[PDB]
């Protein structure tokens, strides 16, 4: 930012001294002094001081940061002619583009490769499909085939994306933030193969960077996946290692992300043509790059002529080959959500918290919709200027993603109260329905639901019938329904309406009617209003499957428990048992069962009998990243308890820690005992 000289920022781990030698030759020929600095955290200092017109004339950094600098207008558009652009590998120019315009010069290229132990594995595998058999071979020799960091998506992405996956679609020099390839058939096939490697004991789901590096550099595993930064540590080991092309999957190359060390020009620089001359004519030449490479190695470089020299090192050649088959890392701000969404998906799928399809689906959603704490924070700040309809829209969308940001939902409630004067019923109802879906109770709880009752009392009968059900049901979820609202939906007219339907929509409306009716029966003791007539109350997951098989083994006989028990309240129990006072199973269906629509037995349960319900909770039954159930299932559990059941909760994350059948039986028996003991303590 000073005329007549050039100031260059570059990270401290690069060959800034070799870069200075280029500056000295530049001064010698042009008379322009060139100064090179390596300030700490320059990738964060640069947007600070360039926003106000200060900083260096040229900055060196990985290309992904430059996309954000350009958005702020901090990087000048560069003007290399086609003659110069032909000197560099074409794909590298695709990394220094913003809104179709070049904003930096490619310098060096970096990507993951396959690193292998030539003593354990003289010829590395060409394909991913061979590795399992190879691991069986090596496990018998006291070794393993492959170990790499499974915790961070940067290392797993080469396999996930091999057969068609991609972060954001790139076309005509631009990224399409709406076109996300996290959940297509290629991403699924790759992740499935990764998960299968784990299930088959060829890889461990806990393996991270440190574990894999130690294993390979100690000679314990025949292969790893890593980058040039890791070569020094292997040189200091005793492993005769090679570096080569990543294996194919479905005959498609592995697609690692590519990092392009680039040089940008400060938009606030008065020496843009001097910076252009130094970069194009002195740095990006065989002599210039050699000078920098002599100080600290660049790895593979974008300049074709010098890459031919460096590529004599077969490790550099493999780096460039993998980069040319890889996916340039998108330089757009939308990648932040990608990293978080995909990281969660891989961990969830590899550990069994989700299937491959479920995990990638959510990562897709998370990447397309850019959900992040910054999103909720941005909305929280707009709240005073948002309309009632915009809040209703917000609430609906967050509830749909099961994303319960307590600070934002409390601001929804306050927003509604501050506009109780003119807020329309639809806008109020959208918030109510969102609160119920996520089981959110605001701090000004009495005030919020007083408004709901007030606004809804006079207009409820005139609403569409299915909507009346949706709204009363939401109040039942939140324990706010009033007898007059229950009555409005439970009087003998409303039923015949939805009762006789095949739509699956009337059937859902009716199911919610059973929940309302169940609330009146079980949670309002003084309720003397109308109820549904007794005559009108009459796909399998792995968790559901294993829970049933484990329970069948414990019970021993079919008569000591009932599986998939449909109640007259709409809810279905995974299982029910009747324990006598000694904790031994009784023949449950020999006894009366008020919770059921049909009577199934005449005998009265012995005194001291304890009726237990096993209730399974699946991953989607919870708010995102929490152990709090959605409203629908808070309501279900509240009803089963009110029906006189002791609860054995079987959430997926508890069952997931039980790796053997013995553990699963022991866990269920413990939960039964604990529930019964919890009760006896209640009665004191
Ligand atoms: O080279 C930058 C980074 O590359 C990747 C590695 O996980 C990290 O250890 C290294 O520092
Ligand atoms: O954290 C509260 C509860 O979370 C869930 C678990 O089923 C339960 O065991 C635990 O007490
Ligand atoms: O290539 C640069 C990238 O490499 C990583 O270390 C991989 O974990 C990232 O943290 C960084 O952004
Ligand atoms: O979200 C709260 C709910 O979470 C559970 O622990 C899940 O098993 C229930 O016991 C509890 O009521």
Author numbering: -58 to 479, 488 to 633
Article sentences:
The Fas-activated serine/threonine kinase (FASTK) family of RBPs has been shown to regulate and fine-tune discrete aspects of mitochondrial gene expression. Here we show that FASTKD4, as well as having a role in non-canonical RNA processing, is required for the stability of the MT-ND3 mRNA through its association with the LRPPRC:SLIRP complex at the 3′ end to protect its polyadenylated tail from degradation.
The FAST2 domain separates the RAP domain from the FAST1 domain, creating a positively charged cavity that could potentially bind negatively charged RNA. Another apparent structural feature is the central helix (Q445-E464), that we have referred to as a ‘Lock’, flanked by two unidentified loops without sufficient electron density. We mutated the cavity site residue D523 to alanine and found that this mutation did not affect the stability of the protein, and it did not affect the processing of MT-ND5 nor the stability of MT-ND3 mRNAs, indicating that FASTKD4 may have lost its endonuclease activity and has been repurposed as an adapter protein for regulating the stability and maturation of specific mitochondrial transcripts. We conclude that L463 and residues 616–618 are required for the stability of FASTKD4, whereas the positively charged residues 620, 622 and 623, and therefore the Key helix interactions, are important for its activity.
